[PDB]
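Still learning folds. Look over my entry:

…
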Amino acid sequence: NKFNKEWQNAFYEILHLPNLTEEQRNGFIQSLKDDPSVSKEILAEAKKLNDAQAPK
């Protein structure tokens, strides 16, 4: 199914990633909406970015 539990978990994980600016956050969210089938890969990249942006 297009908007499965997968898609849902990615949305709320990305929403709560701390090190993303707001622009980045809503960018990954827009991608999730524009292409639900790749929700897994969007989530990975968001974590990858969030983690690459921890202060100190």
Summary: Residues 39-52 form the longest helix (14 residues). Helices lie at 5-15, 22-34, 39-52. The chain has one domain: 1-56.
